[PDB]
Amino acid sequence: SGAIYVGNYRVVNRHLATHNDWANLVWEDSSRDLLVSSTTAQGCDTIARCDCQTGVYYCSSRRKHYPVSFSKPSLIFVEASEYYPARYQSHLMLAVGHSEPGDCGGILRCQHGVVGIVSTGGNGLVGFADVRDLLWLDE
Ligand SMILES: NC(=O)[C@H]1CCCN(C(=O)Cc2cccc3cn[nH]c23)C1
Numbered sequence: 001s002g003a004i005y006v007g008n009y010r011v012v013n014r015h016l017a018t019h020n021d022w023a024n025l026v027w028e029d030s031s032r033d034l035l036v037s038s039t040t041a042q043g044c045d046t047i048a049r050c051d052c053q054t055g056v057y058y059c060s061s062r063r064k065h066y067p068v069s070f071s072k073p074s075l076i077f078v079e080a081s082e083y084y085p086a087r088y089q090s091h092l093m094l095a096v097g098h099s100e101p102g103d104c105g106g107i108l109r110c111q112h113g114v115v116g117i118v119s120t121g122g123n124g125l126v127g128f129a130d131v132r133d134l135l136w137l138d139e
């Protein structure tokens with residue numbers, strides 16, 4: 001579990017979004033596993049605007065932060081789950097690191113701020129949904 005709070009927005013994994021999230025929907029994209037809802041309080045997270053390929057992510061299944069090298073956002077195949085059929089997830093970045101299904105929502109950060117959130121994983125890999133291209137999160 002976990003979300004990004006920036007301005008009047010909450011960013012969460014689309015497969016974990018609540019009734020409140022959908023009742024206050026701003027934007028959602030099933031192909032990115034992202035959903036953004038509105039909030040009645042200010043968000044003080046800073047979104048990075050960069051092409052960093054190194055950072056640190058929070059891993060709830062280990063109660064620890066891990067440094068990672070990650071790939072550039074791209075279309076990557078993802079197995080069927082209960083939330084989605086087999087498909088290509090776009091704007092996805094992979095890293096070598098530990099992750100388990102309940103790790104989704106853990107933030108990936110670089111020196112510039114928030115990069116994305118855990119969305120996929122398995123086999124010693126962790127996948128992050130990128131948020132650096134969503135320039136509207138700031139205005
Ligand atoms: N974005 C999706 O379509 C996902 C929806 C939930 C299921 N899913 C996974 O990847 C499950 C999984 C296994 C093993 C480590 C991890 C870490 N996070 N998620 C992990 C696919």
Ligand SMILES: [Zn+2]
Pocket residue numbers: 048049050051052110111112113
């Ligand atoms: Zn950066």
